[PDB]
Symmetry: C6
Subunit: 100 residues, 6 copies
């Protein structure tokens, strides 16, 4: 429900390579969880990777503090990706390490 | 129904520590009541606290007077919070102490 | 139906005390009638009063003339008010005394 | 259907007295027909009259020509009017006499 | 479906007389076809004529080229027109003769 | 679902001739796939061709990289096209060759 989490403009890295400037994304801590996000070659490349680390900028308007980075630590999908924009994904842990 | 109450940008304090710059929130005096509100570490931290004092700025457009502060005095939720943005909550008393 | 009536920014007075800067309101001559309106301490105070004279500025776009004041002459509600924003109310007479 | 007709800001006259600056109105030649329109004292006064000549400015965007005046030549309603804004009405003839 | 066609601001001529500055219109090649369009005296006059040549400016955003004129070559309707704005009509051929 | 792909302002070429400045288009890798897109003479001409190579500018907001060109390599439709704007189509391969 409101146990949601989402963040503006982000980038996902496959073991070090940036692979898609993923825009709006919105997860759901179930810190394992499910979520969704919308995303050139590189990006798409990165997507195929996350299919098989998404580091964005948190968009909590409440601003309990200010604005921090959010990372989302951690095959059908792989095939769907062979050709809507809201793609599903399932991180295994989330985090808000630094401010900004 | 219209026995509602809501306020723009607010902050909730857990025994003295600010823990989430909670944005739009909207309660419902049943001054005990139920409500909802949408909210980094600190904020989220504060949320886990209110789960187990929300002091915002009233947004009554009628402006019967001007603009005053609203405080909302005073586990499943705690678990939901482990990972939408509209979170539920149940204050035990509300108040409009000062103007602004 | 169209036998409606409504007016922008208004104020309701309880025997002389202003008690809520009530924003948008919209009545319905049945000049007795029913209506609804959306509304700090003072305002809320005034509300508890009207629960048990709303003088606003008419918002008829037709502008058959120009812009005049509208007054709305003249317990469950009282209890609902102990904690949505569209509150119901039932004036016993309406009026458009002066221009502006 | 599309056999409609409507015009921006208008005024209705009861045998010579302007009685309501009626805003958006939209009729329907059945040049007798039915229609609807949304509309201080004077205006409301005029309304009670038309209940028992609406001269506006045509709002045909097609602009087959330019912009002309539209007049709408020629009791339950009377009672409804004792207290929504879209009021019904039934002209007995319409016209687009002059340009502007 | 997408075998549609439409064009901004246009004018329809009855054997040489302009008779309505018809705004947005949208046809459908079935180059015979059906369509709809929304449209003072003159315009309305022209309408009664087309009831019994619509030359507008094409609004294809794809801009496969640029912006060209569209003409639409070539009684119940006649009666409906005696008093909504989206009127139906059935051209017998369409065309995009010149650019602009 | 999110295995979608779409791109702003594009142009489709029939063996070398530009034939329609096709605006918004949105495909779906099933890199063969199905899709839809909305599109003067030339454009329409090109359309009749693709009916029987669409090269646009990718609109991935995620911006995993920046902004690259997207090409979509490779009769009922032909007939529908004889007269809505969202036309269907079925590319046989997609591509994001260069940046921009």
């Amino acid at each position: 429900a409101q146990n949601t989490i989402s963040g503006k403009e982000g980038r996902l890295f496959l073991d070090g390579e940036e692979m898609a400037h993923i825009k709006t994304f919105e997860a759901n801590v179930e810190a394992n969880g499910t979520g969704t996000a919308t995303f050139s070659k590189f990006v798409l490349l990165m997507m195929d990777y996350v299919k098989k680390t998404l580091q964005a900028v948190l968009d909590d308007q409440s601003s309990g503090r200010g604005t921090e980075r959010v990372t989302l630590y951690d095959d059908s999908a792989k095939i769907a990706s062979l050709d809507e924009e809201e793609v599903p994904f399932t991180f295994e842990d989330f985090d808000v390490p630094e401010k900004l």
